[PDB]
Design a protein around this ligand. Structure first.
Ligand SMILES: *[C@@H]1O[C@H](CO)[C@@H](O[C@@H]2O[C@H](CO)[C@@H](O[C@@H]3O[C@H](CO[C@H]4O[C@H](CO)[C@@H](O)[C@H](O[C@H]5O[C@H](CO)[C@@H](O)[C@H](O)[C@@H]5O[C@H]5O[C@H](CO)[C@@H](O)[C@H](O)[C@@H]5O)[C@@H]4O)[C@@H](O)[C@H](O[C@H]4O[C@H](CO)[C@@H](O)[C@H](O)[C@@H]4O[C@H]4O[C@H](CO)[C@@H](O)[C@H](O)[C@@H]4O)[C@@H]3O)[C@H](O)[C@H]2NC(C)=O)[C@H](O)[C@H]1NC(C)=O
Ligand SMILES: CNC(=O)c1ccc(-c2cn(Cc3ccccc3)c3ncccc23)c([N+](=O)[O-])c1
Ligand SMILES: [Ca+2]
Ligand SMILES: [Ca+2]
Ligand code: NA
Ligand code: NA
Ligand SMILES: [Zn+2]
Length: 805
């Protein structure tokens, strides 16, 4: 119930929200059907439109008008945005040359530069170039301020997940808005774009920027606008709030535009109909900047122009139907479209089996345009699993396609020509970032970055301490003129042991064998020095990784590689080696095929054993440092030490062997040497964070050897590829992966072919940031470089996407 007989007089777009049944006059009252009886009359005036004209200049104030051109309007804070231009001979903001804003130039009584976030739904990154002729205000923002060529959204590349990520710095799995549509089985409630459930605060986790501000004494405008409030009114409301007394004025504001998304769905991302929506959004930006100029705020406010996701060509005919795959299609509920989420239709149906649904959806049609995954097997870069609102079965849909349950769903619902929601590395899903104002840099281009990083920056722009989030604070310092955040490296929690030779060969009873009893004073001191760390500067180029949790581990040195060996997990946490451009690949010799050698630095009790592998009919083993890249026949023996062995399914070994034998050398050739750090990951509860020992669900049969869920590699070289990886003077370049450790290659539909036809395609799908690997291992990389720490944070957030231009 709402007692809509209260009044909005003096309350239009009030900031504090009033509680039922009292009627509301705030910017969301329409969405709740709760506005007072006179809200349209008082708050949504439209008389005479949005622009001053010559005949209105100096008019007698008429309170009915949408905006004013009377002499008093500047002090009332409610002139039309073009008032000074039409009536006082001023120029539009867009027609002024840009001039660097070296310091905030703010009116007296401003405690800080305000922040205005201008969010545009569906604004695909390539519109900045492709539409630049029809968007002069935006182009001036972009060319004069700080811009990225694009900004990566979060998955799924839908509106509600992305806007809430922008506001919180959190992945959707952590903030809880995991799609535009959701079912929460604990609440037993559904969240939908239409209707009232979405207003319940229980769906919305983390802490959004407007709450972070309020808690710390910075006032915020309300970020949401009911759809029927016209854009011109949203802008004039922001400008009016900016004219409030100091004690009442917010410091942070957001504008939201449903365009160009709304038209992009109907017409496709580059439909000829799209030009007009782009023109209109530009004109709104112009109104805001003209309005700031009239208030003498145009060199005071930081403006962020930012999109939630892009837009792809998608039509009804490019729909896959689960009814063409599944016998039991009436026993499932599908959340359809540009991603699929499957659960049981009835929790009382005990004949429902995820395994049989996955198998019926796997590589069934030659050009199949979706791929099924149990959610824990999704690429780790998506961070899309740790929430009970995310169904166990997920369908990744190819760009340009939809998935639906049955044909009748699609024609009893061709209308549309555009959609979004696909994998967030897809080029058409990328969106925009421009920052303009005193705290941003002048005419500066920055590399692409992820929208999870902006919350920290928006907190920095406002002097707020960010709530805990998934950005890496400091990684966007290069966007800013001032207000940089200067983090310190985390402290190492565990220091390594450096064991020497402590065990005789006969103390080991590991069931291993090796043909190495093949028998010099020059060469003996030499091998001793390698075991003491004499080649370590070649193979550990950026310092040893720091271990950020309590554990017991050993540093082990060798001619060709260095490792940090966990006495708890019985394998390395990391193995580091450098391969120069000139390195040669060799084979594993015949006499060494099944060679595993005890490591006399590490006790039998802290070692793996061969007999467990022999007995585990499912499980084989591989090596972290690859024997193929040994520097000499004699150094190759080091590669067969039991301390370099890790458990691997035979199907996985196909992938790993090709990576090690072919791809490492290929990258060394292309990049002028590479430094590689490889290791295991254990994430059995799919939370993106390192498992403790007591979370491990699977061991090599009969043993305490834990089975990794994933294997990572971090591959680092010099950004200036004219310098070798091991003698780099300047910035680094990196690519990384987190490969799922699976007992089959069902993910790769072409896996019966030669590895040259499918392995690298698998690795590109599982591309990762160094930061992803850090969360998953509790290690901290790049501790000893010549580079600034902020620069290294940016490197750790880089994702190599393999998307074309
Ligand atoms: C991305 O950044 C985020 C933010 O930093 C990272 O997320 C944090 O990770 C922490 C570890 O997973 C986690 O810390 C836990 O907090 C528990 C208290 O949680 C509440 O309070 C906080 C603070 O206000 C709040 O933010 C939480 O909000 C979550 O929960 C509600 C749902 O009820 C949601 O609305 C909200 O969206 C959010 O959900 C997300 O997180 C939860 C987990 O908290 C998930 O389950 C959801 O799926 C979703 O992803 C909460 O309201 C605290 O109780 C935990 O402590 C337990 O575990 C420790 C281990 O150290 C143990 O010592 C304790 O005894 C305790 O164990 C007991 O409970 C167990 C489970 O019932 C039981 O088995 C034991 O036997 C014990 O009884 C823990 O400290 C922190 O909450 C989240 N924060 C957020 C916002 O998500 C995230 O890791 C980053 N991602 C990456 C990849 O880096
Ligand atoms: C048909 N869909 C709509 O009309 C529509 C869809 C989404 C939103 C919306 C606005 N913010 C606030 C905001 C603004 C800028 C940056 C971050 C956050 C969100 N934060 C989370 C989820 C949805 C929204 C609104 N809106 O303005 O209320 C309308
Ligand atoms: Ca959107
Ligand atoms: Ca984990
Ligand atoms: Na075996
Ligand atoms: Na396969
Ligand atoms: Zn949309």
């Amino acid at each position: 119930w709402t007692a809509t007989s209260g009044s909005c007089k003096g309350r239009c777009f009030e900031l504090q929200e009033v509680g039922p049944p009292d009627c509301r006059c705030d910017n969301l009252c329409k969405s709740y059907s709760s506005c007072c009886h006179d809200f349209d009359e008082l708050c949504l005036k439209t008389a005479r439109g949005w622009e001053c004209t010559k005949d209105r200049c100096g008019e007698v104030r008429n309170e009915e008008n949408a905006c004013h051109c009377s002499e008093d309007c500047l002090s009332r804070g409610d002139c039309c945005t073009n008032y000074q231009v039409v009536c006082k001979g001023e120029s539009h903001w867009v027609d002024d040359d840009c001039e660097e804003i070296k310091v905030p130039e703010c009116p007296a009584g401003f405690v800080r530069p305000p922040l205005i976030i201008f969010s545009v739904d569906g604004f695909r990154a390539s519109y900045m170039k492709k539409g630049s002729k029809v968007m002069p205000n935006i182009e001036k923002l972009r060319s004069c301020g700080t811009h990225a060529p694009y900004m990566r959204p979060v998955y799924p590349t839908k509106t509600f997940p992305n806007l809430y990520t922008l506001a919180t710095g959190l992945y959707p799995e952590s903030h809880g808005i995991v799609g535009n549509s959701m079912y929460d089985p604990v609440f037993d409630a559904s969240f939908h774009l239409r209707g009232r459930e979405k207003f319940n605060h229980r769906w919305w986790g983390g802490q959004p920027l407007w709450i972070t501000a309020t808690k710390q004494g910075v006032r915020a405008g309300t970020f949401f606008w009911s759809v029927s409030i016209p854009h011109e009114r949203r802008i004039l409301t922001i400008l009016q709030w900016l004219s409030l007394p100091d004690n009442e004025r917010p410091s942070v504001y957001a504008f939201y535009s449903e365009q160009p998304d709304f038209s992009g769905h109907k017409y496709g991302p580059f439909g000829p109909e799209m030009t007009n929506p782009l023109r209109e959004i530009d004109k709104t930006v112009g109104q805001l900047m003209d309005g700031l100029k009239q208030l003498r705020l145009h060199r005071c406010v930081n403006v962020i122009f930012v999109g939630d996701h892009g837009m792809e060509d998608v039509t009804c005919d490019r729909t896959e139907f689960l009814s063409n795959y599944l016998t039991n299609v009436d026993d499932i509920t599908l959340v359809p479209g540009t991603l699929g989420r499957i659960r049981a239709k009835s929790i009382n149906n005990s004949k429902y089996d995820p395994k049989t649904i996955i198998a019926a959806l796997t590589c069934k049609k030659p050009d199949q345009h979706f791929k099924p995954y149990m959610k824990q097997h999704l690429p780790k870069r998506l961070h899309y699993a740790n929430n009970r609102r995310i169904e166990d079965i997920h369908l990744l849909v190819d760009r340009r396609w939809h998935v639906a349950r049955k044909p009748l769903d699609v024609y009893k619902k061709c209308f549309f020509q555009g959609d979004h929601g696909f994998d967030n590395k897809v080029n058409s899903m990328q969106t925009v970032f421009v920052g303009y104002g005193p705290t941003f840099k002048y005419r500066t281009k920055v590399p692409p970055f992820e929208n999870i990083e902006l919350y920290n920056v928006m907190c920095d722009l406002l002097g707020l301490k960010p709530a805990p989030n998934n950005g890496t604070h400091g990684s966007l310092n290069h966007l800013l003129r001032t207000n940089t955040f200067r983090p310190t490296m985390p402290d190492e929690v565990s220091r390594p042991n450096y064991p020497g030779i402590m065990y005789l060969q006969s103390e080991f009873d590991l069931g291993c064998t090796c043909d190495d009893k093949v028998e010099n004073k020059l060469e003996e001191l030499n091998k001793r020095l390698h075991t003491k760390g004499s080649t370590k500067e070649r193979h550990l180029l950026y310092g040893r990784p720091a271990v950020l949790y309590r554990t017991s581990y050993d540093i082990l040195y060798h001619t060709d590689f260095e490792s940090g060996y966990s006495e708890i997990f019985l394998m390395p946490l990391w193995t580091s080696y450098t391969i120069s451009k000139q390195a040669e690949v060799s084979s594993i010799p015949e006499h060494l095929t099944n060679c595993v050698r005890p490591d006399v630095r590490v006790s039998p009790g802290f070692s793996q054993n061969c007999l467990a592998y022999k007995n585990d009919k499912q499980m084989s083993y591989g090596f972290l440092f690859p024997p193929y890249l040994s520097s000499s026949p004699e150094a190759k023996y080091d590669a067969f030490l039991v301390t370099n062995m890790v458990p691997m399914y035979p199907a996985f070994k196909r992938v790993w062997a090709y990576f090690q034998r072919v791809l490492v050398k290929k990258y060394a050739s292309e990049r002028n040497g590479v430094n590689v750090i490889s290791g295991p990951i254990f994430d059995y509860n799919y939370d993106g964070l390192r498992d403790t020992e007591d979370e491990i669900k699977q061991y090599v049969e009969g043993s305490s050897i834990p089975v990794p869920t994933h294997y990572y590699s971090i591959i680092t070289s010099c950004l200036d590829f004219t310098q070798p990886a091991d003698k780099c003077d300047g910035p680094l370049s990196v690519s990384s992966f987190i490969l799922p450790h699976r007992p089959d290659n069902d993910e790769s539909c072409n896996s019966s072919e030669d590895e040259s036809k499918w392995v690298e395609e698998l690795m590109k799908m599982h591309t990762a940031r160094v930061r992803d690997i850090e969360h998953l291992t509790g290690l901290d990389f790049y501790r000893k470089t010549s580079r600034s720490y902020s620069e290294i944070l940016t490197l750790k957030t880089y994702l190599h996407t393999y998307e074309s231009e």
